[PDB]
Amino acid sequence: AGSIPGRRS
Amino acid sequence: AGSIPGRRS
Amino acid sequence: GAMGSMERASLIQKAKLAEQAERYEDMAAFMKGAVEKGEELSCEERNLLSVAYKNVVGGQRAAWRVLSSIEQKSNEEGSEEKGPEVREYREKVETELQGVCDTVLGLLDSHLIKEAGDAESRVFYLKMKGDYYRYLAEVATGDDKKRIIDSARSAYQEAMDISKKEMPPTNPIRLGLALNFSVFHYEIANSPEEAISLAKTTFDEAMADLHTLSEDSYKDSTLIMQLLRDNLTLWT
Amino acid sequence: GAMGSMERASLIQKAKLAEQAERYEDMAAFMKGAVEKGEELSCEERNLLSVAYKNVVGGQRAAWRVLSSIEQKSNEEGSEEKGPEVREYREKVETELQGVCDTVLGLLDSHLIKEAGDAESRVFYLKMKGDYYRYLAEVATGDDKKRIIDSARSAYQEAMDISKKEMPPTNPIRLGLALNFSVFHYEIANSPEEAISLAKTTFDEAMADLHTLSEDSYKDSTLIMQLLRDNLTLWT
Ligand SMILES: *Cc1ccc(NC(C)=O)cc1
Ligand SMILES: *Cc1ccc(NC(C)=O)cc1
Ligand SMILES: [Ca+2]
Ligand SMILES: [Ca+2]
Ligand SMILES: [Cl-]
Ligand SMILES: [Cl-]
Ligand SMILES: [Mg+2]
Ligand SMILES: [Mg+2]
Structure with a gap:
């Protein structure tokens, strides 16, 4: 179950 | 120019 | 502080440098500084905050899961006593994870959310709020686990109410909020049907609104829509 | 401390946990603790120390290079003044890198090296010593840059002298020492011919000794021999 990766801006 | 990666033990 | x-402006500039150097702890410290200046954040500034902390807590979560898993194996039938070390270190990581979550939640409460009037800012911060309670919920086992869960649900829900009222179905923030909230339902609230219904409805309303978008917006929206689809594939 | x-034993156990959780700062802190107990380290314990710090300083070096490169671009003709931020942050990373190097060098000097009598332990620590001066040398620009360089060369050279006397040509530590020392020649000492000659001689003497090895040793030796070959390919 993937959330927003939100790792790169 | 690669040195010993030495990152995993 | x-x-x-x-x-x-130097804190912001250095936050961008830290991101390029993959120094996410520095990035986080820098944006914490930025926030504590007391001015509202621009869209780009909100993203820098979000990205900084998401990377920090993400490293912590991955470490926690590794340790929690070693811990669970060690507490099995036929497993050999290794001492208190595994639990101790899991607890240390856990404590550090919670500190970070409390720090972000602290910034949101003092005073990002109450100053956020625009839909885009308010929803963004309430989404974060839901996310950071969700991360707390992942490791919670005590008297207030349910309260932690409810705090997440409540922040997510208020975000959704505003997003449905003020933003189009393809809005990336609305989409990412709905994705994350549906993960909440599935992973935290034991509500996999809710999770599947939300993700499905979100995906379909977005689909129907793509025609209104430019090529750049279309790319933004469809990327998150694909994350909704991936979850649905896994869950169904 | x-x-x-x-x-x-708990510090060692937790160092292994930290490695599995990719928490290299914790790993490093744990092995620093372990070392400061004052007992010599086993082979496996030396590796844990080495791996912990190599990962920490490796993250620092990668960040430094990113920032140093932004810094150099910004100080070009036609480049727009952005202020002191780039240099400031490069300096912060640099300071933190140097602190880590001084910490490792501190442990080697107090008192790992003087207690290391066996070839395998002594060479291992002198190799580390050369490595950590090399990392200092990478960022050095002041009155003692040359002294820093010479400190590396001197630790590397003493390591080599013992390794040539006490270990077979295929010894993984001898091989990794020679690889690293040849990188030193190429990247730090401006001696690319020395670098190429060392790597070549090392590779060929090892080649000729592989027949004496078991399958597991053969795998250990050939892996590092391939790193020597990769460098030679790049350098010739
Ligand atoms: C929460 C969130 C939602 C969407 C994105 N991507 C874009 C383009 O906004 C990032 C974070
Ligand atoms: C310095 C060094 C040399 C060799 C290795 N690999 C093995 C198997 O020892 C690691 C570090
Ligand atoms: Ca406002
Ligand atoms: Ca000894
Ligand atoms: Cl601990
Ligand atoms: Cl700085
Ligand atoms: Mg000012
Ligand atoms: Mg004891």
Whole structure:
């Protein structure tokens, strides 16, 4: 179950 | 120019 | 306050540098400084905050899961006593994870959310709020686990109410909020049907609104829509 | 000393946990604690120390290079003044890198090296010593840059002298020492011919000794021999 990766801006 | 990666033990 | 003597604009500039250097702890410290200047954040500034902390807590979560898993194996039938070390270190990681979550939640409460009037800012911060309670919920086992869960649900729900009222179905923030909230339902609230219904409805309403978008917006929206689809594939 | 109240064996156990959780700063802190107990380290314990710090300083080096490169671009003709931020942050990373190097070098000097009598332990530590001066040398620009360089060369050279006397040509530590020393020649000492000659001689003497090895040793030796070959390909 993937959330927003939100790792790169 | 690669040195010993030495990152995993 | 570590960063109290650095200029707002320097903190922002250095946050971008830290991201390029993959120094996410510095990035986080820098944006914490930025926030504590007391001015509202621009869209781009909100993203820098979000990205900084998401990377930090993400490393912590991955470490926690590794340790929690070693811990669970060690507490099995036929497993050999290794001592208190596994639990101790899991607890240390856990404590550090919670500190970070409390720090972000602290910034949101003092005073990002109450100053956020625009839909885009308010929803963004309430989404974060839901996310950071969700991360707390992942490791919670005590008297207030349910309260932690409810705090997440409540922040997510208020975000959704505003998003449905003020933003189009393809809005990336609305989409990412709905994705994350549906993960909440599935992973935290034991509500996999709710999770599947939300993700499905979100995906379909977005689909129907793509025609209104430019090529750049279309790319933004469809990327998150694909994350909704991936979850649905896994869950169904 | 943070770790002064934790058991040696718990520090080691937690270092292994930290490695599995990719928590290299914790791993490093744990092995620093372990070392400061004052007992010599086993082979496996030396590796844990080496791996912990190599990962920490490796993250620092990668960040430094990113920032140093932004810095150099910004100081070009036609480049727009952005202020002191780039240099400031490069300096912060740099300071933190140097601190880590001084910490490792500190442990080697107090008192790992003087207690290391066996070839395998002594060479291992002198190799580390050369490595950590090399990392200092990478960022050095002042009155003692040359002294820093010479400190590396001197630790590397003493390591080599012992390795040539006490270990077979295929010894993984001898091989990794020679690889690293040849990188030193190429990247730090401006001696690319020395670099190429060392790597070549090392590779060929090892080749000729592989027949003496078991399958597991053969795998260990050939892996490092391939790193020598990769460098030679790049350099010739
Ligand atoms: C929460 C969130 C939602 C969407 C994105 N991507 C874009 C383009 O906004 C990032 C974070
Ligand atoms: C310095 C060094 C040399 C060799 C290795 N690999 C093995 C198997 O020892 C690691 C570090
Ligand atoms: Ca406002
Ligand atoms: Ca000894
Ligand atoms: Cl611990
Ligand atoms: Cl700085
Ligand atoms: Mg100012
Ligand atoms: Mg003891």
